[PDB]
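On clarity, I found the account of how folds are encoded harder to follow than it need be. Since the whole study asks how a given chain folds, the encoding of that fold should be made plain. For illustration, here is how one protein appears when written out as sequence plus structure tokens:
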Amino acid sequence: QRAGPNCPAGWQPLGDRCIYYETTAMTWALAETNCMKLGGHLASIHSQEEHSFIQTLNAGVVWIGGSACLQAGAWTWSDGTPMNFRSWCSTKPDDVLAACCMQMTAAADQCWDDLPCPASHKSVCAMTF
């Protein structure tokens, strides 16, 4: 008798860790809110190939990077520090109040590009224990 796979319940312990995914267009507001109630936040990437994962699914854009709309040139994670690895294309254009919620389109040629926040795109959430 040894009950204990990975996650507790109402989650998705794919492999070992725990991650979530959706399809219906639900931006930061719709995603983050529902995601918060679950227990986690907008997933991220490190192994790179994992980035290919969300790109392989294809279901809109993915809100993953953080946010910046109350400082002078300061981009970080959702609520921490910044990341690395990103040689898709040149740096994002502009960086004023015009955009507050970062965004990485998913057209293959769209390349990363900040957004103003309203753009109901699929949700990509991850988590651990």
